[PDB]
Design a protein around this ligand. Structure first.
Ligand SMILES: O=P([O-])(O)O
Ligand SMILES: O=P([O-])(O)O
Ligand SMILES: [Cl-]
Length: 276
């Protein structure tokens, strides 16, 4: 029943929102470029539309990344598909080189799965649990994974524990899920009480920044401790090749980067036989 999300013996390199430092976030321009640069998959976010479709999108509103305004939840997919989601992407010249160009439209999560069937998906359920969108997004996420037979290549997580809990109740463990902040806290407590003999029953992925408020989270013993706890350590915001190799060597299993160019460099360094 447990999905074989992790295959081979190499950590997965994910492009942050498709590689948002180099191309307009969440667009085909970004996903195509990151895939060409050799990433193993895409980290991304989903928001629910007025007509209850999951789009690949970060903010609650379209203002920051498009020429439109207002909540995703107040727009139909049809209305959202008319927008230019590269409208505000600026290069270091200050130009907006992709505004008005092809392949700049908002993607649905369904067409992300169909269009990139070889990519692993690391997806964040963004709508809040107390919102209407949050109450139905986990089911629609599962329905989307199921109709595309993508159970073994999608990792579903959320900032909100209740969204993970809602999704996992529907998926019944058939899709890999992220470890919530509260779940890891409970794990540290059970560890201290029971001694080193404790370990989480089901392996879940705990994605961390490499640092928080001056605290370095990349210690070799911490990563080993989490692996000992049956917690899958992962990191985001990894934007140097030395840090990528360091986390690979220490036992991290997922790595989200804003610079998908590093993926190609990382993979030429590892043997081909470690990949599946
Ligand atoms: O997709 P993120 O930026 O919320 O991690
Ligand atoms: O605002 P986020 O990207 O930290 O969720
Ligand atoms: Cl609009």
């Amino acid at each position: 029943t447990i999905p074989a999300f992790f295959k081979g013996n190499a950590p997965y390199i994910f492009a942050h929102r498709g590689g948002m430092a180099l191309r307009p976030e969440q667009t085909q321009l970004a996903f195509d470029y990151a895939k060409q640069l050799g990433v193993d998959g895409f980290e991304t976010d989903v928001r629910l539309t007025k007509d209850q479709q999951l789009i690949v999108f970060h903010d609650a509103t379209v203002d920051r990344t498009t020429n439109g305004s207002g909540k995703v939840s107040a727009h139909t997919l049809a209305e959202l598909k008319k927008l230019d989601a590269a409208y505000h992407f600026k290069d270091i010249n200050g130009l907006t080189p992709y505004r008005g160009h092809a392949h700049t439209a908002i993607l649905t999560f369904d067409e992300l799965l169909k269009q990139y069937p070889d990519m692993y998906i690391n997806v964040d359920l963004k709508d809040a649990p107390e919102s209407y969108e949050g109450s139905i997004a986990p089911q629609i996420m599962f329905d989307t994974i199921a109709e595309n037979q993508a159970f073994d290549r999608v990792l579903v997580t959320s900032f909100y524990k209740e969204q993970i809990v809602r999704f996992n109740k529907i998926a019944q463990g058939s899709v890999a899920i992220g470890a919530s902040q509260q779940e890891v806290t409970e794990a540290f407590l059970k560890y201290h009480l029971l001694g080193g003999r404790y370990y989480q029953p089901l392996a879940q992925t705990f994605q961390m920044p490499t640092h928080f408020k001056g605290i370095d989270l990349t210690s070799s013993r911490f990563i080993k401790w989490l692996n000992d706890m049956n917690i899958i350590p992962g990191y985001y915001g990894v934007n140097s090749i030395n840090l990528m190799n360091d986390l690979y060597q220490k036992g991290a299993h997922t790595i989200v980067t804003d610079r998908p160019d590093l993926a190609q460099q990382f993979k030429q360094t590892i043997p081909n036989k470690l990949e599946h």
